[PDB]
Amino acid sequence: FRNNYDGDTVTFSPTGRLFQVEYALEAIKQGSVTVGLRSNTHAVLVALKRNADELSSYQKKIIKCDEHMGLSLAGLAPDARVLSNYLRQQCNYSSLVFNRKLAVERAGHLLCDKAQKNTQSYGGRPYGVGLLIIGYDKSGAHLLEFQPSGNVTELYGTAIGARSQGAKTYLERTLDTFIKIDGNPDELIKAGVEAISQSLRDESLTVDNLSIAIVGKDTPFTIYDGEAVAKYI
Amino acid sequence: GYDRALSIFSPDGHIFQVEYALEAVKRGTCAVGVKGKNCVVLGCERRSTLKLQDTRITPSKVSKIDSHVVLSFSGLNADSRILIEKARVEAQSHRLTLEDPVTVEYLTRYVAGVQQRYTQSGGVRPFGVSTLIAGFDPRDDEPKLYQTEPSGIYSSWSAQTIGRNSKTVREFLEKNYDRKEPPATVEECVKLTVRSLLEVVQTGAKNIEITVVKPDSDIVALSSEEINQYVTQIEQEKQEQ
Amino acid sequence: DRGVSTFSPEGRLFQVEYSLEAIKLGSTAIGIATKEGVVLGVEKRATSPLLESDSIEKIVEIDRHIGCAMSGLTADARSMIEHARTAAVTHNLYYDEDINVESLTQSVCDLALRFGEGASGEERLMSRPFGVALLIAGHDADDGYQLFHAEPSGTFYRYNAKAIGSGSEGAQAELLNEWHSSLTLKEAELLVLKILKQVMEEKLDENNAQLSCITKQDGFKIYDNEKTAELIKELKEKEAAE
Amino acid sequence: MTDRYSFSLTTFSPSGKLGQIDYALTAVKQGVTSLGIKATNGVVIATEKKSSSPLAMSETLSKVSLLTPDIGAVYSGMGPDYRVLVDKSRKVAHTSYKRIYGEYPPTKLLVSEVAKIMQEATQSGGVRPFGVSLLIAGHDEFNGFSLYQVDPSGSYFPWKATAIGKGSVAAKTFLEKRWNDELELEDAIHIALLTLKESVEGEFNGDTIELAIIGDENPDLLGYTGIPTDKGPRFRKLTSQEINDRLEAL
């Protein structure tokens, strides 16, 4: 069955599925958990950095695309670089040409259309990475969830990666609480660290292991690592 | 238009098309090269599946890329032409832009590159050829001998052989060549080569061609007689015991 | 058949994975970083006594402050090395400064996934991934001495010490214990020379093993045999010492 | 999109055969018979108009076509393939000859041209060979009259007479018996009609038969007067009425 319909993305299975795309989606689950949540004044990203040996570094999970936009990745690092880099250009182009900050909602529409192109043309492959984009624009704070399928969705919060379901339930529960954490970044962040520890198991988030990012009203998207996150562990 | 990836990785991490390319080399006639203290010699066997050829015209096994450098090979002939051409053209280009002939090492590194490229470019199969490149760097007297293969890898040897039964002759050489004291003579150097070929040629006076290269573009290919003589003096070495 | 850029149901790229295999078969290569410099060591592995062991180049210079060691299909490394050298030199031409060791690495890594038979994202012309991994070592004024591991996957990590090649898994295990934040350059040299001796089928000597390093003062240098030999002799004595 | 078929669709089998070309020939075998006869003062080519429905008007379709005013062609195999081959052959005659020498190409060369076209459909990326065989007949000042047969392989050869398609073996045998190097055109025309009758099941008349000739110059078919050196086309398709008249002397 499945073996005859997953040799490329230009093939539908008798049931209407695109396996190659699904296999890509898998790479995400195999990825280190990362959480995103927002209030009305700020948006936050918390991600678990995974390392190879104990002699190696922990790989970056958060990328800045502009002063008002950024994202966290789970899955194929290279593809995140490609996609984030492309999202940087779009923000850039929006400025240079219209002297206008690229609205988060639009950045999403752009990502979706970019992804979609690699799922209907021979020779191309889907992107094996999931993204959580946060950003503050003319309509406030925003959180987006990007799936290689092309499906981009705006949420109050969410998570992706191995054991992500843990944090997601936790947020789904804490909802009415963190959404009102306005005028206080540290609070929105702690709620973010909690949601993520909900997907721990192996170990516990340490200083050179935890990664946090925040954007907001008067806050330019800024990433925190090591000693910087110490005050949250 | 055609760009099918023909050289790809397999589960065990191999690139069969490149590997099979080598098999094409193993089936090719044997070629050997030994460097003396003031020269390099290249020997090649002549197949015998059909004999009634016109040796005058029939393309020989050792080619001149430039006046101070030669290249012999084992594998598919049609393929060797393409490589020999590119090498020769690069030889001139290097003189033209660097105002100095190519070093044996360089010309080698170039050829190796061409081959490597053909192992990771769409729509093309690797070269079923392995080469022996020898000569003397410009205004230098230390002999050079390198070898390349389909994979695109290369390196220098004090002596080496490629082709069918190269396994045998390599052994011969591994236990008949001393780096301490390399064939200090053009003669004793060509002898060692003829000796090494005989191990596999099975009496072929007309089946073994030798080419001697000396410093300052002094390249020459011996005739059947000069060679026949070497074979002669050698066969006695055995009987006189 | 099946696309060269196809996904496995487990979410991996076949070609990339298989690529990693060919590398496990490659010659051993080890790198250890110290606050005094980074040391790069490799296994020559001559397939015959007639092969002039020094014509074996598996440790090359990218710039005066950046060098690297390779493992796997080494012919694949040429185009990468060229790219790396060009990028480092160009950055110097455009910014009047040395290129950061990380960026250099990041630059190389970008070629990695540039392959396929018609991948919709640009013009990725290269039929297959690279069959070689790289240990990029160097120094800059922003992050001092650095050691990087770049795989055909397109990703790269930074290790205090890392060993790739046939003897890796074991050697890496060794390094896990041996390495510590206060190693000296001299110490790292013997340590590399030691772990090489362990995983090498051959009896390690200054002719089938090669050491080199990168120091802020003298930059990337490759230890000439004589220098390596003595270090080997030194290693033996301290080993037989207990 | 983009024809990603940049590879040959006709390749060598371990036996050394070229499948598609073989199959193409099979396709020719299945096709209606058609023949050609070379007389000492002309050539004749004919086939059967196998009306594929009584409602269809066989006139609105010609199996016999004029390539140049002195060269005609007829086939056996896949009608549509022939059709485009004709147009191509008519153009190639201009583009690669009349536009360069100001004169129509001689039979052998035009044939040589068509052959090349087919030859290419046998090696080019993403295509199949042509499922037809052609019988081209013409005349030129320095070669006189000639008859050629072109195969899907891209091969062609000259004939004194020959037939292809369905009952080719039968007809070929009947021609070897009636041909001689002294036939006048009217003779060949007769022999043609006889050779044809054998392969014909039902009706056999000027409306079911299609035959043309390459004989003398028809100035009456030129369309204009005033130029001595322009004498008219040697090619001429016979009319239904012209055919029946001859059928009575059958």
Add this chain to the structure above:
Amino acid sequence: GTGYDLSNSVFSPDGRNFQVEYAVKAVENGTTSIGIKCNDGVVFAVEKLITSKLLVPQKNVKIQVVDRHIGCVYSGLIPDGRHLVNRGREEAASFKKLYKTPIPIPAFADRLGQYVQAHTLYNSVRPFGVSTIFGGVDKNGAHLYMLEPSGSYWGYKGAATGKGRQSAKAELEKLVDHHPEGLSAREAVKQAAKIIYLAHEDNKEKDFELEISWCSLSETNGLHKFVKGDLLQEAIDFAQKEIN
């Protein structure tokens, strides 16, 4: 033999294109969406499943506008849906630029039709995983259209696609019968909200969010617009009431 369903442009022995047929599967599996052609415009509505309380309400908009007078809604693979609308937009823009007049609904239909049909011609492409209900007002009235992955499309009085496609088609047909003289834009908005609420039973598991948009000559001046606020709640109510 078999395998006539592994490549996109292949004809099965019975004359079908399984790949296209498999696409339809991806569609039927999607959310439900409809279109109601009133007497001077068209109304569009869609089912928006609430996968979780995390989805910011009213945010992930589905219905899309092409130019200023055309509306598009589709069921199936959303990304494919957007892809199609992008093309429609370029298509409409190209048209206006040369003929000045904003593209006629019919012409636009065939514009999307030929594009989609184009993806059933080569094995190097995949057919569209969406059915699209679209339309608007032009020089001669309103027009409602539905386009299938096969590239097929026709003008409808009412149209539905997706999971609850049958419940809908059932209800739409009822309307057509009980309104020979026509439905008003205002009324079609209500009726649509109801028809979406009913069709939601074949998915009564997850909670949803309604989304209506219309293009009425008298209500929106021939411009496509989203039904919001009061008129929206009013319809949500008219539906919630008749669902009990």
Add this chain to the structure above:
Amino acid sequence: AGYDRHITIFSPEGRLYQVEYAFKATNQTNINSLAVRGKDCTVVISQKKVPDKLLDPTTVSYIFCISRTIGMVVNGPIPDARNAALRAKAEAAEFRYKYGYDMPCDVLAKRMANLSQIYTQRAYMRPLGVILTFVSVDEELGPSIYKTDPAGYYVGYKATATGPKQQEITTNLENHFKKSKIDHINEESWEKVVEFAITHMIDALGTEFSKNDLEVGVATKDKFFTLSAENIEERLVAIAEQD
């Protein structure tokens, strides 16, 4: 080896299955149609079947106006039917522009046929599952009927039928002509030729029709037009007051 049935390459029998399967798709609509030649007009009748009540009957049709003089009725799925129509329309406009006169029905057919032939020989182009019947009153040829198929074949007819019960309609017509001895309906007005067409369409299919079960197209000197539900109704009433 067994892919000689997936793309347009030869089978050992020397056949092109994909072309055959294409033909198979032409009946996918289960609609029959026929064309007859009047004294100086040409009519094409086609069945119209709109089952769904939600469909706007007026937008459904397999009859197309390629140009002021050429009309085309397609037997086959509609998306392929429209791809074909559009192309023919373009081919018609371009011809006029380049040669300074209206493309003749037969030439348009030949061009479309040659176009089909290509999908027959080139691997990446699939054939179109449709049979195209072109009709007009050519300024040089008189009333004309030219039909093309997925094989890249075409020819002119005295009359013709297409669809599932093609054979019944054909033999019906064949008989009428064997009888009349002429290759056309000896009628001056097209309304009578339209009635004739509809009549035999009934006799051959053994079915009665309502104004909404048909689709009619007429081609007269310098114009081809399709009838309306009413134009047809009035025509149906006519055949009725004769039976």
Add this chain to the structure above:
Amino acid sequence: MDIILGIRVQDSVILASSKAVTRGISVLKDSDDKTRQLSPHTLMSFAGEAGDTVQFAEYIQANIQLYSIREDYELSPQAVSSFVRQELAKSIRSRRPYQVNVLIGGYDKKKNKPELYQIDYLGTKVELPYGAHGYSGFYTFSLLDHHYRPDMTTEEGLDLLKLCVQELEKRMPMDFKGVIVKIVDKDGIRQVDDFQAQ
């Protein structure tokens, strides 16, 4: 222009070429060798535009040597010149044409006869007993037209040149700093290093 002379005597071809390199107001060099050896028995002298001059000569050289290696044979002078003419003839109708004029002198080892070819940037080729490019022609053709004999020895040829060079120094505006003379014959190409007073 610069001085490019060529004279074919009995068994060799002699080429003389001015050693001066002047850029505007200053004479930058007085030892310039405006010649390139295409093969052991074929020499080509050149003069023309600043860059085009060498660029073209070296290019021609590269191609001739490549043919030598590929065929392990030396193309006849006649052939070599035909190659050169073709190249210039192409160049003339290109985007930016080579503005170079050349004299080709070689010894045909097969025919066993020396040859002199004159070719201008337009691809005009002519074979002559003696020839020159630029103005030199105006003062030397009459000299040679007068004192020239087909059976002249190489030495007679040199003297004849000596005669031409003197006239050129006497009546010419420019100081071409003397000429470099080279002889092509059965034994190859050699340079008469003593002509600054022969």
Add this chain to the structure above:
Amino acid sequence: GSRRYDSRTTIFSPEGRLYQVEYALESISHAGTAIGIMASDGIVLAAERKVTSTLLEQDTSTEKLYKLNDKIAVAVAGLTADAEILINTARIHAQNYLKTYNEDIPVEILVRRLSDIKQGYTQHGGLRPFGVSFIYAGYDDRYGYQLYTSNPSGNYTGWKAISVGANTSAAQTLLQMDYKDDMKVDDAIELALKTLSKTTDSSALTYDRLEFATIRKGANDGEVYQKIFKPQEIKDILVKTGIT
């Protein structure tokens, strides 16, 4: 995609062989035999016409012996159509060499170019090789009379006597059995026909099934000459050599 129908005509076999080249050769083994013999004063080309008939117009025919230059000609074995495509490019190459150097193209040089073209279809392109093998017979002033052979692989070699097509092994043995370095054209002419005569798959070796050609230097001139015997010329020489 399309990869599904790609024969990959240019890959290696696990044994390091080139499938298509091999198969191509297999094809050539069934082609009329062509023999080339080189004597001290000239060369001979003899080939057997595959498939003939009473009706075949033999005077106007040529399927094996082609004139390339004035001093070069070839004998073919394999797909005639393929051969021509290569022959024409050969004829052109000769002319270009002439136009560039004003000298007649050296035999080996033309042969190397043709072989290189073949070799190409062997390493890239995804197309099938040419089903042809050539016996080149030519003369130039550098190597005098020469005899070469090339095949689908792209390799070429020189010979004193050689054959291609069917029953080559049989013919090679017979030639290798009676060839002598001091042969004379006439001698070679006979040896050629005798060989064919003994290898022919047919009843008798008649003129109507042959094509003959000789490259001799007619003493009473000093220039070399190409003679491609006409039907009658073959019929004669056939009676003379004692095969009547």
Add this chain to the structure above:
Amino acid sequence: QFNPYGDNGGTILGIAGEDFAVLAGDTRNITDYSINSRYEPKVFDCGDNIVMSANGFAADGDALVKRFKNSVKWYHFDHNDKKLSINSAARNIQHLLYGKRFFPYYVHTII
């Protein structure tokens, strides 16, 4: 014929102190004998403590600043927010300008 260039006047001045530096410019933009504006800033802060001004033809001047600034933005992305040394900016700008060496930015710039 169409002249792609223009002159907006203006004048700038840069002076380097031992632990500081200054870049000044008039704020008048003109065209011929008319004044387009009495206040149209011409010296900009491009970040990383670098002030730049491209004087001459306004269009070309703004294009350059925009470009250089944008070049700085990416420098940060590419090299981990590392500050761009003045000397590096100089080299970079040279490339910005010499890139259009055959259809120049009609501006004389100072940073």
